[PDB]
Amino acid sequence: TPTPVSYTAGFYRIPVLGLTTRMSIYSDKSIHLSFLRTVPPYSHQSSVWFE
Amino acid sequence: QTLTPILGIHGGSSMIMADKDESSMFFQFGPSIEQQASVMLNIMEEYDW
């Protein structure tokens, strides 16, 4: 849902942006040259489990 | 977003590999990059490279 405008305005060789989203799909470094989380994703509870 | 089919061969999209959506309606290219590796294997099985 925070995902469409990142695709449109991520076409233009747009560097990394930090936006407080809920994109898990932010480790897909071809389809976005622009994502940076400021909150851990849905999967990132795993090392929190590992401890 | 539109549920409409789009096909083709064309341009800069030479064997594009991505995590496209499930509900997208579009097919493109020809062989996969691993089917390409399979023909690269058939190439190396011609001269035992």
PDB file of C-alpha atoms in Angstrom:
ATOM      1  CA  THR A   1       0.000   0.000   0.000  1.00  0.00           C
ATOM      2  CA  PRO A   2       2.920   2.509   0.467  1.00  0.00           C
ATOM      3  CA  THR A   3       4.211   0.751  -2.718  1.00  0.00           C
ATOM      4  CA  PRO A   4       2.812   2.477  -5.923  1.00  0.00           C
ATOM      5  CA  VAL A   5       4.410   5.928  -5.753  1.00  0.00           C
ATOM      6  CA  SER A   6       7.763   4.287  -4.906  1.00  0.00           C
ATOM      7  CA  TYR A   7       7.558   2.453  -8.231  1.00  0.00           C
ATOM      8  CA  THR A   8       6.591   5.495 -10.270  1.00  0.00           C
ATOM      9  CA  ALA A   9       9.005   7.952  -8.684  1.00  0.00           C
ATOM     10  CA  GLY A  10      11.655   5.220  -8.282  1.00  0.00           C
ATOM     11  CA  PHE A  11      12.112   4.857 -12.036  1.00  0.00           C
ATOM     12  CA  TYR A  12      14.236   7.966 -12.417  1.00  0.00           C
ATOM     13  CA  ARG A  13      17.487   6.668 -10.762  1.00  0.00           C
ATOM     14  CA  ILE A  14      16.394   7.838  -7.319  1.00  0.00           C
ATOM     15  CA  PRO A  15      18.685   7.205  -4.325  1.00  0.00           C
ATOM     16  CA  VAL A  16      17.807   5.639  -1.026  1.00  0.00           C
ATOM     17  CA  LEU A  17      14.809   7.045   0.883  1.00  0.00           C
ATOM     18  CA  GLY A  18      13.793   6.309   4.504  1.00  0.00           C
ATOM     19  CA  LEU A  19       9.990   6.261   4.880  1.00  0.00           C
ATOM     20  CA  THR A  20       8.662   4.258   7.959  1.00  0.00           C
ATOM     21  CA  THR A  21       6.776   1.779   5.777  1.00  0.00           C
ATOM     22  CA  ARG A  22       5.715  -1.867   6.194  1.00  0.00           C
ATOM     23  CA  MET A  23       7.468  -3.079   3.037  1.00  0.00           C
ATOM     24  CA  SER A  24       9.038  -6.468   3.578  1.00  0.00           C
ATOM     25  CA  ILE A  25       9.795  -6.263  -0.178  1.00  0.00           C
ATOM     26  CA  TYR A  26      12.584  -3.729   0.462  1.00  0.00           C
ATOM     27  CA  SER A  27      15.419  -6.216  -0.002  1.00  0.00           C
ATOM     28  CA  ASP A  28      14.882  -6.428  -3.747  1.00  0.00           C
ATOM     29  CA  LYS A  29      17.675  -4.079  -4.758  1.00  0.00           C
ATOM     30  CA  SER A  30      17.028  -4.204  -8.485  1.00  0.00           C
ATOM     31  CA  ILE A  31      13.312  -3.317  -8.395  1.00  0.00           C
ATOM     32  CA  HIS A  32      14.119  -0.442  -6.016  1.00  0.00           C
ATOM     33  CA  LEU A  33      17.299   1.633  -5.875  1.00  0.00           C
ATOM     34  CA  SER A  34      15.508   3.725  -3.231  1.00  0.00           C
ATOM     35  CA  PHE A  35      14.372   1.938  -0.073  1.00  0.00           C
ATOM     36  CA  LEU A  36      15.661   2.251   3.507  1.00  0.00           C
ATOM     37  CA  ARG A  37      13.705   1.146   6.477  1.00  0.00           C
ATOM     38  CA  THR A  38      13.462   3.172   9.673  1.00  0.00           C
ATOM     39  CA  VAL A  39      11.615   0.381  11.501  1.00  0.00           C
ATOM     40  CA  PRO A  40      12.428  -3.332  11.214  1.00  0.00           C
ATOM     41  CA  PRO A  41      10.292  -5.395   8.843  1.00  0.00           C
ATOM     42  CA  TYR A  42       7.896  -8.238   9.482  1.00  0.00           C
ATOM     43  CA  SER A  43      10.647 -10.826   9.025  1.00  0.00           C
ATOM     44  CA  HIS A  44      13.233  -8.973  11.165  1.00  0.00           C
ATOM     45  CA  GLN A  45      11.903 -10.494  14.402  1.00  0.00           C
ATOM     46  CA  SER A  46      14.060 -13.519  13.581  1.00  0.00           C
ATOM     47  CA  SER A  47      17.382 -12.630  15.223  1.00  0.00           C
ATOM     48  CA  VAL A  48      15.187 -11.334  18.084  1.00  0.00           C
ATOM     49  CA  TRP A  49      14.096 -14.967  18.237  1.00  0.00           C
ATOM     50  CA  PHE A  50      17.680 -16.191  17.769  1.00  0.00           C
ATOM     51  CA  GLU A  51      18.745 -14.444  20.973  1.00  0.00           C
TER      52      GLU A  51
ATOM     53  CA  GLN B   1      -3.945  -2.908 -11.611  1.00  0.00           C
ATOM     54  CA  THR B   2      -5.791  -3.335 -14.911  1.00  0.00           C
ATOM     55  CA  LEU B   3      -6.077  -7.159 -15.328  1.00  0.00           C
ATOM     56  CA  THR B   4      -5.199  -6.939 -18.996  1.00  0.00           C
ATOM     57  CA  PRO B   5      -2.713  -9.065 -20.952  1.00  0.00           C
ATOM     58  CA  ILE B   6       0.490  -7.628 -22.363  1.00  0.00           C
ATOM     59  CA  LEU B   7       2.871  -9.742 -24.424  1.00  0.00           C
ATOM     60  CA  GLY B   8       6.028  -9.214 -26.415  1.00  0.00           C
ATOM     61  CA  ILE B   9       9.709  -9.553 -27.158  1.00  0.00           C
ATOM     62  CA  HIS B  10      10.782  -6.075 -27.235  1.00  0.00           C
ATOM     63  CA  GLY B  11      13.536  -3.538 -26.524  1.00  0.00           C
ATOM     64  CA  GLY B  12      15.631  -3.305 -23.376  1.00  0.00           C
ATOM     65  CA  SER B  13      13.666  -6.104 -21.709  1.00  0.00           C
ATOM     66  CA  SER B  14      16.125  -8.816 -22.689  1.00  0.00           C
ATOM     67  CA  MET B  15      15.390 -11.712 -20.288  1.00  0.00           C
ATOM     68  CA  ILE B  16      14.261  -9.633 -17.327  1.00  0.00           C
ATOM     69  CA  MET B  17      14.152 -11.535 -14.029  1.00  0.00           C
ATOM     70  CA  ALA B  18      12.100 -10.042 -11.221  1.00  0.00           C
ATOM     71  CA  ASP B  19       9.568 -10.719  -8.470  1.00  0.00           C
ATOM     72  CA  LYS B  20       6.562  -9.540 -10.429  1.00  0.00           C
ATOM     73  CA  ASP B  21       3.086  -9.777  -8.957  1.00  0.00           C
ATOM     74  CA  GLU B  22       0.825 -12.816  -8.825  1.00  0.00           C
ATOM     75  CA  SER B  23      -2.191 -11.019 -10.301  1.00  0.00           C
ATOM     76  CA  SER B  24      -0.277  -9.420 -13.154  1.00  0.00           C
ATOM     77  CA  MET B  25      -1.347 -10.559 -16.610  1.00  0.00           C
ATOM     78  CA  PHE B  26       1.757 -10.513 -18.802  1.00  0.00           C
ATOM     79  CA  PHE B  27       4.214 -12.930 -20.367  1.00  0.00           C
ATOM     80  CA  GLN B  28       7.200 -11.950 -22.444  1.00  0.00           C
ATOM     81  CA  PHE B  29      10.480 -13.231 -23.412  1.00  0.00           C
ATOM     82  CA  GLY B  30      11.492 -16.696 -24.599  1.00  0.00           C
ATOM     83  CA  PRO B  31      13.799 -19.001 -22.633  1.00  0.00           C
ATOM     84  CA  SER B  32      14.608 -18.493 -18.955  1.00  0.00           C
ATOM     85  CA  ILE B  33      18.120 -17.662 -17.747  1.00  0.00           C
ATOM     86  CA  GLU B  34      18.453 -21.223 -16.531  1.00  0.00           C
ATOM     87  CA  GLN B  35      17.058 -22.677 -19.718  1.00  0.00           C
ATOM     88  CA  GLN B  36      19.769 -20.482 -21.252  1.00  0.00           C
ATOM     89  CA  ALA B  37      22.194 -22.165 -18.877  1.00  0.00           C
ATOM     90  CA  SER B  38      20.834 -25.531 -20.059  1.00  0.00           C
ATOM     91  CA  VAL B  39      21.610 -24.652 -23.679  1.00  0.00           C
ATOM     92  CA  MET B  40      25.001 -23.426 -22.398  1.00  0.00           C
ATOM     93  CA  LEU B  41      25.374 -26.912 -20.956  1.00  0.00           C
ATOM     94  CA  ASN B  42      24.438 -28.443 -24.307  1.00  0.00           C
ATOM     95  CA  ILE B  43      27.148 -26.228 -25.745  1.00  0.00           C
ATOM     96  CA  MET B  44      29.713 -27.453 -23.276  1.00  0.00           C
ATOM     97  CA  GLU B  45      28.559 -31.036 -24.004  1.00  0.00           C
ATOM     98  CA  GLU B  46      29.435 -30.545 -27.668  1.00  0.00           C
ATOM     99  CA  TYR B  47      33.210 -30.086 -27.206  1.00  0.00           C
ATOM    100  CA  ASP B  48      33.379 -31.469 -23.602  1.00  0.00           C
ATOM    101  CA  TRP B  49      34.256 -28.061 -22.249  1.00  0.00           C
TER     102      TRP B  49
END
